[PDB]
Design an enzyme around this catalytic site. Structure first.
Site, mmCIF file in Angstrom:
data_model
loop_
_atom_site.group_PDB
_atom_site.id
_atom_site.type_symbol
_atom_site.label_atom_id
_atom_site.label_comp_id
_atom_site.label_asym_id
_atom_site.label_seq_id
_atom_site.Cartn_x
_atom_site.Cartn_y
_atom_site.Cartn_z
ATOM 1 N N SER A 1 0.814 -1.211 0.000
ATOM 2 C CA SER A 1 0.000 0.000 0.000
ATOM 3 C C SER A 1 0.849 1.265 0.000
ATOM 4 C CB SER A 1 -0.937 -0.002 1.207
ATOM 5 O OG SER A 1 -1.943 -0.987 1.070
ATOM 6 N N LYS B 1 -7.927 3.680 6.914
ATOM 7 C CA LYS B 1 -6.999 4.711 6.458
ATOM 8 C C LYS B 1 -7.661 6.082 6.448
ATOM 9 C CE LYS B 1 -4.234 1.559 3.639
ATOM 10 N NZ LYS B 1 -4.098 0.974 2.279
#
Ligand SMILES: Nc1ncnc2c1ncn2[C@@H]1O[C@H](COP(=O)(O)OP(=O)(O)O)[C@@H](O)[C@H]1O
Ligand SMILES: Nc1ncnc2c1ncn2[C@@H]1O[C@H](COP(=O)(O)OP(=O)(O)O)[C@@H](O)[C@H]1O
Ligand SMILES: [Mg+2]
Ligand SMILES: [Mg+2]
Lengths: 527, 252, 186
Positions: free
Chosen positions: A435, A478
């Site tokens: 990521s 996130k």
């Protein structure tokens, strides 16, 4: 003898199937031939008791009122919309068809979210009998299948005893912690669950003691698990996977001020007039002490506050006490999560990233520095307990950063020759995943150009060798972690638009969201 | 018969829940027809021995008094102010609610700080029965959950053994070295408020109420404790002593 | 077989809930890529039970399922992107892979790691297995030989430092089936 009629007249209210009645008849005929005190007589008597105790044709008085069911479901748990919707759909379907039905469901999610607790509330809503069957660490297949009559201590097993004790043929069976079932050496209980949890073969579940198939198609099977990856695929494919996503801070506040605080006051024996917890205090407690996805630690903190107040009251130190955000640390101690952001202003070479963590997600920073004093070829050292996937992503990011600077500024010899060290300052904790590839590219380019990125920008997304941005997981966590910090703009892959806009409205109110397909767009956004 | 009357005299003073009473009644009826020499008779007798020995309705008379408990705690140990505060809060909550209650605690710290002696002192102050067993290096689940009646070597496990020994449903149970466990899935069911009240043992085949039991765990590092098990219990740090505190302990 | 039985279980007539061939095809393509049938049965039952709930609650008299509102019944599609590159740049070649959820395609990307196009090297990333890394080495050697015999003046493969990546970075992959794809990419 009178034992034969004591057997027979309690089948009167049961619609016994023929394949069971013809076995009951032969066992009764055998019973009258054996000596009344022989061991075979005792074995036959026990087997006839077990066959007779089964609820062969009786069901619980299930209610189909949608409003009553919703009221019962809402009074115990907050915001479990998926499970409640599934149960209301179950009720509607069972209302369209003229008879009861059975299903196999599996609730999975982070610990402390209410998977085990919601089962009893569902059973109360459906007016079904409730049984809990914890399989954590279980290695005995005989608990599911039982033992043959020939053995001295033979018993049918847990499921047949559920039918016996609940006295209904359609109970609610909670198979708690299915993913933690034991890898037994002498047997594999999870392989016996294939017959128990087979949507087509439930009608012919064969017990090793009874030696007679029982219709388990009307039983509602609910399983709880922490992770689905551990459950065997042949068993996972049979169960219906529905997720419980955990709770956001606002949902935690709703649960606390609506369910946790009243129940904790009832447990501590206090009243609202003697111990008052305001919404500000609960919000501060959740913000600074209860970052986990579950509500068990929040429950423990609330009970700690209430027990401190109860001691303060009983001992005579105070007639009543009110909790304030100033004096909360007197009750719970000094805050645990006192800092949200490592860098208030990011120097050149460091870029703010986002990571999924068990504590409701967290942010990360990617630091780059010049390891040798010059702005043969360059090298990249990586530290920070990076996993193999993350190290490979760092290598890909380094290659693409070199390639990108080759064309954006051909005179810039930085990345080609300079020796760079890349670190993620959470060095004590392991971190893995692709990521952070675009974050690493941005850090490298900011170091090479000497230009810091936008001071309130966060970003995530896997990068390819040619610079294409690929979708990543954990968008909710996130986003929450970014919103805790002063992030004003967030960069996400274009393929993540669909599950970013699936988030609740209050989560994404103030974020300037940018969706990208190639890194050349992130470069324009950040620089 | 003599055996049935003995088992019922064992059962006179207990306020037994309805389901347990039904199980005992059906097992007594089963025993009333088996021959004395039968092995199934031995199995049923051994089963009824355990069911008639569980203290279904007996509670120890706790000393719900802050002054005497504080005196005992401060006379038995030095400097454990966090543990003493926690126990005084427990006593205050028990007094305010007007009924006995159970909690799950965990004392973690360097060895030799007094984690087990303080637990014995807490049991003394609360007038609760004391029992302890170690899970360090444990790899067998069956020693907690037990084995069913079918097997010859079946035992009802440490928790049922403790319940039989202490003769009360609210003892103080010390689980020692929870961080050195190999098996934790049985503990997850053992100490969980949602399911403590219906703890089912494989041998008993009948649930027992462990909601009033005070569980105290002992460890040295929290990080090695299993993650789903670290969430059920409360962590209290029993830290080490400075030279002055060690001198006071040695003198006193 | 599946839809009639699911209707018989949910009690919904065809007039009350419409499941056309187009929506079934879309549902299979986007949600039931596995080789089995149970998950397709579960998706069909989910659609029918949501239609039944809508009918019983009085929200609607008849429920029509369309390829536009299917996501309201079965959520976001599991599979949406079938190929990473619409048009492949020079360094990348499209390949094919075996997967449990039906077939899966893969791409092989190569790019210069150092500016100049003393041996060169091939860096291999993408969670490649030992067999697949060995196939990458064999492919690199044969690519050098083939470019040597086809274009003698082209010393690109012998001197340049090249990074080879298979952009399914988080998914492990192994097997020699990608040898010709790697040769073509190089
Ligand atoms: N949505 C909710 N509303 C109210 N209480 C909740 C909710 N979710 C969890 N709880 C409480 O938190 C505890 C969670 O324990 P449990 O249900 O065992 O979670 P899990 O199934 O994840 O182990 C329960 O005792 C329950 O009372
Ligand atoms: N604060 C204290 N006050 C009085 N005695 C103490 C104190 N700390 C330790 N001790 C003594 O030290 C011994 C510690 O043994 P034990 O508690 O079994 O070890 P551990 O603390 O590793 O479990 C006890 O016998 C106790 O009497
Ligand atoms: Mg649970
Ligand atoms: Mg000790």
């Amino acid at each position: 003898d009178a034992i034969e009629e004591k057997f027979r007249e309690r089948l009167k209210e049961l619609v016994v199937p023929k394949h069971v009645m013809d076995v009951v008849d032969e066992e009764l005929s055998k019973l009258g031939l054996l000596d009344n005190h022989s061991s075979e007589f005792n074995v036959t008597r026990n087997y006839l008791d077990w066959l007779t105790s089964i609820p062969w044709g009786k069901y619980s008085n299930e209610n189909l009122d949608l409003a009553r069911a919703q009221a019962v479901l809402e009074e115990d748990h907050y915001g479990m919309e998926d499970v409640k919707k599934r149960i209301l759909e179950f009720i509607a379907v069972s209302q369209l068809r003229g008879s009861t039905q059975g299903k196999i469901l599996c609730f999975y999610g982070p610990p402390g979210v209410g998977k085990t607790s919601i089962a009893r509330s569902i059973a109360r809503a459906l007016n079904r009998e409730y049984f809990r069957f914890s399989v954590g660490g279980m290695t005995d297949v005989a608990e599911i299948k039982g033992h043959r009559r020939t053995y001295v201590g033979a018993m049918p097993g847990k499921i047949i005893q559920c039918l016996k004790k609940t006295k209904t043929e359609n109970p609610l069976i909670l198979i708690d912690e299915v993913d933690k079932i034991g890898r037994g050496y002498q047997g594999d209980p999870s392989s016996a669950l294939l017959e128990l949890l087979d949507p087509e073969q439930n009608a012919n579940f064969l017990d090793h003691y009874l030696d007679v198939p029982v219709d388990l198609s009307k039983v509602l099977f609910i399983c709880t698990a922490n992770v689905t990856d551990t459950i065997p695929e042949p068993l996972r494919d049979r169960m219906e996977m529905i997720n419980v996503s955990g709770y956001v801070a606002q949902e935690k506040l709703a649960i606390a001020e609506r369910y946790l605080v009243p129940q904790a006051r009832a447990l501590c024996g206090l009243d609202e007039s003697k111990a008052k917890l305001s919404s500000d205090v609960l919000t501060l407690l959740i913000k600074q002490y209860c970052r986990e996805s579950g509500v068990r630690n929040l429950q423990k903190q609330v009970e700690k506050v209430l027990r401190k107040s109860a001691y303060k009251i009983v001992s005579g130190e105070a007639e009543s006490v009110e909790v304030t955000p100033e004096n909360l640390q007197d009750f719970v101690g000094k805050p645990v999560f006192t800092v949200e952001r490592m860098y208030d202003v990011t120097p050149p070479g460091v870029v703010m990233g986002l990571a999924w963590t068990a504590m409701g997600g967290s942010t990360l920073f990617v630091e780059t520095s010049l390891r040798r004093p010059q702005d043969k070829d360059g090298s990249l050292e990586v530290t920070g307990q990076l996993g193999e996937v993350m190290k490979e992503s760092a290598r890909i990011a380094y290659t693409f950063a070199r390639a990108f600077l080759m064309q954006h500024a051909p005179a810039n010899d930085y990345l080609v020759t300079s020796h760079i060290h890349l670190h993620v300052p959470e060095g004590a904790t392991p971190k893995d995943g692709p990521s952070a590839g675009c974050t690493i590219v941005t850090a490298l380019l900011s170091l090479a150009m000497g230009r810091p990125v936008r001071q309130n920008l966060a970003m995530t997304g896997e990068v390819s060798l040619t610079g294409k941005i690929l979708p990543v997981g954990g968008i909710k966590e996130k986003t929450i972690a970014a919103k805790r910090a002063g992030v004003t703009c967030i960069v996400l892959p274009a393929e993540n638009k669909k599950d970013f806009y699936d988030l609740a409205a209050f989560i994404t109110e103030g974020l300037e969201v940018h969706f990208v397909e190639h890194y050349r767009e992130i470069f324009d956004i950040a620089f």
